[PDB]
From a paper:
The crystal structure of the Mth10b monomer is of mixed α/β type, and consists of two α-helices and four β-strands with a topology of β1-α1-β2-α2-β3-β4. The strands β1, β2 and β4 are parallel, while strand β3 is antiparallel to the other strands. Two adjacent asymmetric Mth10b monomers interact with each other side-by-side along the long dimension of the monomer, forming a dimer with a crystallographic two-fold axis perpendicular to the long dimension of the dimer. The overall structure of the Mth10b dimer resembles a body with two long, extending, flexible β-hairpin arms, agreeing well with the dimeric structures reported for typical members of the Sac10b family. Helix α2, and strands β3 and β4 are involved in dimerization, through hydrophobic interactions as well as hydrogen bonding. In addition, each monomer in the Mth10b structure contains four salt bridges: Glu31-Arg89, Lys35-Glu85, Arg37-Glu69, and Glu49-Arg52. Though Mth10b is an acidic protein, the concave surface of the molecule corresponding to the DNA-binding surface in Sso10b is dominated by positively-charged residues, but its positive electrostatic potential is much lower than that of Sso10b. The other three pairs of conserved positively-charged residues, namely Lys16, Arg44 and Arg83 in each Sso10b monomer, are substituted, respectively, in Mth10b by neutral residues Asn11, Ile39 and Thr77, suggesting that these three pairs of residues should be key to the interaction between typical Sac10b family proteins and DNA. Mth10b mutants N11K, I39R and T77R with the neutral residues changed to corresponding positively-charged residues acquired DNA-binding activity and the triple mutant N11KI39RT77R exhibited even higher DNA-binding activity.
The Sac10b protein family, also named Alba, is generally regarded as a family of DNA-binding proteins that are highly conserved and widely distributed within the archaea. However, unlike typical Sac10b family proteins, Mth10b is an acidic protein which contains 13 acidic amino acid residues and only 8 basic residues, and its potential isoelectric point is only 4.56. However, electrophoretic mobility shift analysis (EMSA) showed that Mth10b does not bind to either DNA or RNA.
Residue numbers in the entry:
A (entry chain A), B (entry chain B): 5 to 90
């Protein structure tokens, strides 16, 4: 389950998800922070639109998390969680 | 009561939202496509965390919109919808 979207190409994450669900896994949750947020929405839509029609988007949550940014100091980021179920 | 979120500074949008919701309008829909998706979630979080603690996130939808270029070029863009309510 749980697939963290980062700075790798969207397709890499799309392939991760798909492999997992073709392999039998029923649920994956996409997690992303900040700028990767739009890329997580991208992974969800591509997987549904091109690979696993059937896939249900169960529940989407957003929150705020705290991380230490590139400058060395604490900072708050938006985050998203997308529950995929086949 | 629908706000389109693009590439303007985040606070521009936050302003528009808060003003509206404090001055009556009890429901508002955030909408964005592509990378603005990130800005859109930020706006929501900044509102719910900094300005109107009470606010409720009614519903988040995602989908793919298709747009046509001047020349005929069809593009699939990811898109999001965030319903807020006080």
């Amino acid at each position: 389950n749980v697939v963290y979207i980062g700075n790798k190409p969207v397709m890499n994450y799309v392939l991760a998800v798909v492999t997992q669900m073709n392999g039998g896994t029923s649920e994956v949750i996409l997690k992303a922070r900040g700028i990767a947020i739009s890329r997580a929405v991208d992974v969800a839509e591509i997987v549904r639109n091109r690979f696993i029609p059937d896939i249900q988007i169960e529940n989407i949550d957003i929150c705020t998390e705290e991380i230490i940014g590139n400058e060395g100091t604490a900072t708050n980021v938006s985050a998203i969680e997308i529950q995929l179920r086949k």
